[PDB]
Amino acid sequence: SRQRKLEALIRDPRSPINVESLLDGLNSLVLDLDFPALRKNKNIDNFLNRYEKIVKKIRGLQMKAEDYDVVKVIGRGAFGEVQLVRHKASQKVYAMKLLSKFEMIKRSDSAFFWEERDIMAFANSPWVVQLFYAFQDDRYLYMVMEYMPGGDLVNLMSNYDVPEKWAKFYTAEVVLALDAIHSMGLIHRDVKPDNMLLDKHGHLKLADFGTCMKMDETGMVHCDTGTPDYISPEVLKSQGGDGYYGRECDWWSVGVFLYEMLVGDTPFYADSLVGTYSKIMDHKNSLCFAEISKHAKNLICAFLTDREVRLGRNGVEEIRQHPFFKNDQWHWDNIRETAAPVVPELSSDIDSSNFDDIEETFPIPKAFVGNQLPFIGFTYYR
Amino acid sequence: SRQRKLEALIRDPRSPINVESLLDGLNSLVLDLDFPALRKNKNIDNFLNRYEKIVKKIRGLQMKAEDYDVVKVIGRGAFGEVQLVRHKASQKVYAMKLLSKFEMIKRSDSAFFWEERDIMAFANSPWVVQLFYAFQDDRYLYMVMEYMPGGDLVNLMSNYDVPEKWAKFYTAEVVLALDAIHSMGLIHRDVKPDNMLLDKHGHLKLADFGTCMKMDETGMVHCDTAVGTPDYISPEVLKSQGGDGYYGRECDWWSVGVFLYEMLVGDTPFYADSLVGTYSKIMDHKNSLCFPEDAEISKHAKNLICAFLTDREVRLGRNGVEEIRQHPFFKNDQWHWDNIRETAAPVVPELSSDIDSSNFDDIEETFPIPKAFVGNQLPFIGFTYYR
Ligand SMILES: Cc1[nH]ncc1-c1cc2c(s1)C(=O)N[C@]1(CC[C@](O)(c3ccc(F)cc3)CC1)N2
Ligand SMILES: Cc1[nH]ncc1-c1cc2c(s1)C(=O)N[C@]1(CC[C@](O)(c3ccc(F)cc3)CC1)N2
């Protein structure tokens, strides 16, 4: 066949050897070889003279952080900040998440983003925040995503006293969004109001995929990797050395979310990491309520039990037909194209009134350290 | 102002960042990192576990040396042999030059082939031997060229007594071959009968481009190394070893002079028992150059040689290739300069089959595992070429 089998692999933007990735493999080789210490090497100097020229040019004609106006900083993650940005040429407003390369190399935390990228880029769901451009430089990783001007549910829940019928909507849109995540053979692990963003029209989209794992042939995962509030008992227990868990661990998170939304506090709240963790483990005795209807009370309890009997172990169908999700203005077939509880009031394309306000280098190597190598293949254009 | 600018750079076959070279980039990185000592590094291991699998599958599709049957070894250069090969699938015959990656690295001389490749892969001249494929593996560099069953001119000079009528032809063809090399912006520096091969029809081609330098924007080169074979070296290239060297194409016309002298006299002009003696005779070429009493040579032939074998300032061909063409020696009734290559050759080779190598005499170690990063395969990233 020759270069037909090989041409196909290059074309696929899902394959790790697409053109953009091959270019990363050159840049990160130049970026990690270009230090005077290592330059004493004959081989490393031959290479860098022949390529440094053309490599610098390439760097020029592909997406940079300079190609964006930074309207304002709207969030701050574990590694970098999330910015509200406007691309200069097209003038289109996006949300740009920065990830610090150095703060990732300085931690057992420099592979998480691969799932965060693949989901947001290729999920193609109405339930997933959508990635347009993924690019990098010597310092940072960048993801350019559709901006969600509606805020997150942590902001809504503090701003509005949430009544039962509002929770019927919000829980349901999480259920569906989660099912979409599951149908890509993935568990979210850490589902919570922070990863729940609202769009222009007040509808849900999941966002923070950092802690995602891909299910086994069976459907479980068997490896250890935050803060407990919304985390399932089996997941905490399994941090001490293996033991599988599955998709049902996300449904636990949902119950915690429905509780917090209806009551006001998380069901296992305590003013310490230890306290919430301890309460979760003894969930049999710790969960108690009030002013909640029996149908809503019941769904919370069907979620907040160990994985064996937890609602949604048998399927997403159990959840749907539950008496709590019975209303008038939406069916599961059209929930997204109905009116949301809170449709956000938006002045312009850069309005961020649903978000609040907020106000590093690599060490020059002696030997080859390969700091950029973990980030080869991250670059992506729509 | 678009990434369609970039799109062009990738597609351009003679661009440093074509897809083959980008894939070489990924490959020679996997090769220079996959060692247990190196893999103690988190980064290098994070990388290899994600790429090593797919990289292996690619290597599978890449042109192996297994793709060829080796008919006979027909030559051996400094850094490896030249095998007469038949490509298995196509069943076509090729000459394949091997270049040892180890011996090339071990001797600090590992940049000479880049020109050698471009000349053969892109010359498109009937005077330049032509490259079809250029692949590599961890151990070797490979050059698949069109086979030249006729043999080299060193062979022709020791099987036949060359009369001046033949010398006229061969010298003329060498002259035109070099003009084609020059018109591509390159000086050869190593013109010799060994680098002069003969096609199926007994006609010339130039072969060993390892020593080639590309002229600057003014047709001159700055070289401070005395490069090439000691017998054919020009006084300027020789002197250039010490201090600022400065020369153009003229040095190639020196070689042509020596070539002709060898062909008519039967010996090189500045021959000596040592290398160090040959150099000295070249330096004192006014006094050392003389034709023997017994060798009979036309007054035209001696004129052409001596016009070639002088200081660059007064050397023939300094004022264009034209003053060579019209030289009285090149007067004949058998070929013009327009056609020469389509006249009958003085020696047409008798080939019995497509693997006949009767015009070639028959004949008849790797890297250590590194501690840290060494990048042994880095000088070879981008070698790979296909037609
Ligand atoms: C706004 C937008 N529009 N289109 C995409 C986005 C994203 C926003 C974030 C995204 S995308 C993300 O990936 N991470 C975070 C990092 C900050 C976070 O941890 C936070 C903030 C405040 C809290 F009170 C608690 C938590 C939430 C997740 N933010
Ligand atoms: C035959 C063919 N067909 N298509 C390409 C070729 C090439 C052949 C060679 C090529 S291409 C080459 O690059 N190098 C050499 C290595 C051996 C050499 O140095 C030599 C020196 C003195 C000798 F008495 C004999 C041989 C000559 C050049 N051979």
mmCIF file of C-alpha atoms in Angstrom, chain A residues 2-3 5-6 9-10 16-17 19-23 25-26 29 33 41-44 46-47 50-51 54 57-58 61-62 105 107-108 110 114 368-371 373-374 376-377 381, chain B residues 3 5-6 9-10 16-17 19-23 25-26 29 33 41-44 46-47 50-51 54 57-58 61 63 105 108 110 114 133 373-376 378-382 386:
data_model
loop_
_atom_site.group_PDB
_atom_site.id
_atom_site.type_symbol
_atom_site.label_atom_id
_atom_site.label_comp_id
_atom_site.label_asym_id
_atom_site.label_seq_id
_atom_site.Cartn_x
_atom_site.Cartn_y
_atom_site.Cartn_z
ATOM 1 C CA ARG A 2 2.847 2.374 1.004
ATOM 2 C CA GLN A 3 1.830 5.878 2.162
ATOM 3 C CA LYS A 5 -1.946 3.362 5.512
ATOM 4 C CA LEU A 6 0.460 6.006 6.801
ATOM 5 C CA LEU A 9 -2.904 7.948 10.629
ATOM 6 C CA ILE A 10 -1.593 11.482 9.977
ATOM 7 C CA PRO A 16 -1.395 10.717 18.499
ATOM 8 C CA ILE A 17 0.653 11.080 15.274
ATOM 9 C CA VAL A 19 0.538 16.676 11.912
ATOM 10 C CA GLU A 20 0.028 19.048 14.867
ATOM 11 C CA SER A 21 1.422 16.422 17.261
ATOM 12 C CA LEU A 22 4.461 15.716 15.060
ATOM 13 C CA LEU A 23 5.228 19.442 15.226
ATOM 14 C CA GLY A 25 7.446 16.483 18.911
ATOM 15 C CA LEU A 26 9.866 18.836 17.180
ATOM 16 C CA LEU A 29 12.679 18.528 21.400
ATOM 17 C CA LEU A 33 17.739 20.597 23.951
ATOM 18 C CA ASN A 41 27.012 17.757 22.910
ATOM 19 C CA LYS A 42 27.989 17.388 19.214
ATOM 20 C CA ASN A 43 24.689 15.716 18.292
ATOM 21 C CA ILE A 44 22.497 18.211 20.181
ATOM 22 C CA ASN A 46 24.236 19.661 14.970
ATOM 23 C CA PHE A 47 20.485 19.248 15.347
ATOM 24 C CA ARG A 50 19.853 22.856 11.452
ATOM 25 C CA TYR A 51 16.374 23.227 12.970
ATOM 26 C CA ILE A 54 12.705 26.901 10.904
ATOM 27 C CA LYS A 57 9.345 30.537 12.301
ATOM 28 C CA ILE A 58 6.685 27.852 12.888
ATOM 29 C CA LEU A 61 2.568 31.288 12.651
ATOM 30 C CA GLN A 62 0.522 29.266 15.149
ATOM 31 C CA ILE A 105 5.833 18.856 36.272
ATOM 32 C CA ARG A 107 3.592 16.978 40.913
ATOM 33 C CA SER A 108 2.247 13.473 40.169
ATOM 34 C CA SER A 110 0.771 15.882 34.476
ATOM 35 C CA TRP A 114 -5.601 14.438 28.181
ATOM 36 C CA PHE A 368 18.411 16.402 29.515
ATOM 37 C CA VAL A 369 15.332 16.558 31.758
ATOM 38 C CA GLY A 370 12.626 16.521 29.060
ATOM 39 C CA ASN A 371 10.173 18.918 30.709
ATOM 40 C CA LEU A 373 7.802 15.827 26.590
ATOM 41 C CA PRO A 374 4.623 15.237 28.640
ATOM 42 C CA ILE A 376 3.680 16.649 23.054
ATOM 43 C CA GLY A 377 0.418 16.251 21.141
ATOM 44 C CA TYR A 381 -7.413 23.260 16.166
ATOM 45 C CA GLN B 3 -1.843 28.379 8.792
ATOM 46 C CA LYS B 5 1.289 29.160 4.945
ATOM 47 C CA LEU B 6 2.386 26.284 7.185
ATOM 48 C CA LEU B 9 6.007 24.047 4.295
ATOM 49 C CA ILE B 10 4.913 20.523 5.292
ATOM 50 C CA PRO B 16 13.334 20.642 6.568
ATOM 51 C CA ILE B 17 9.869 20.034 8.069
ATOM 52 C CA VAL B 19 6.114 14.897 6.954
ATOM 53 C CA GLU B 20 8.916 12.306 6.515
ATOM 54 C CA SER B 21 11.319 14.471 8.513
ATOM 55 C CA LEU B 22 8.672 15.135 11.160
ATOM 56 C CA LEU B 23 8.191 11.367 11.528
ATOM 57 C CA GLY B 25 11.826 13.485 14.454
ATOM 58 C CA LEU B 26 9.406 11.405 16.507
ATOM 59 C CA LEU B 29 13.526 10.625 19.808
ATOM 60 C CA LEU B 33 15.258 7.808 25.033
ATOM 61 C CA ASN B 41 13.144 9.948 34.442
ATOM 62 C CA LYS B 42 9.378 10.501 34.884
ATOM 63 C CA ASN B 43 9.092 12.655 31.739
ATOM 64 C CA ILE B 44 10.986 10.296 29.424
ATOM 65 C CA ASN B 46 5.572 9.343 30.466
ATOM 66 C CA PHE B 47 6.433 10.060 26.841
ATOM 67 C CA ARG B 50 2.256 6.876 25.193
ATOM 68 C CA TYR B 51 4.198 6.927 21.910
ATOM 69 C CA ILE B 54 2.359 3.707 17.655
ATOM 70 C CA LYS B 57 3.798 0.287 14.001
ATOM 71 C CA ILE B 58 4.990 3.193 11.824
ATOM 72 C CA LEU B 61 5.502 0.489 7.295
ATOM 73 C CA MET B 63 11.127 0.956 3.929
ATOM 74 C CA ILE B 105 29.235 9.501 14.816
ATOM 75 C CA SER B 108 32.718 13.379 14.258
ATOM 76 C CA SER B 110 28.206 13.145 10.318
ATOM 77 C CA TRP B 114 22.888 16.098 3.384
ATOM 78 C CA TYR B 133 14.813 6.126 -2.005
ATOM 79 C CA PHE B 373 20.692 11.500 26.842
ATOM 80 C CA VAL B 374 23.207 11.361 23.981
ATOM 81 C CA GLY B 375 21.096 11.882 20.849
ATOM 82 C CA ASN B 376 22.996 9.559 18.494
ATOM 83 C CA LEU B 378 19.657 13.369 16.027
ATOM 84 C CA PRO B 379 22.114 14.112 13.172
ATOM 85 C CA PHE B 380 20.028 11.824 10.937
ATOM 86 C CA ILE B 381 16.528 13.274 11.592
ATOM 87 C CA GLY B 382 15.155 14.216 8.178
ATOM 88 C CA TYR B 386 10.849 8.742 -1.275
#
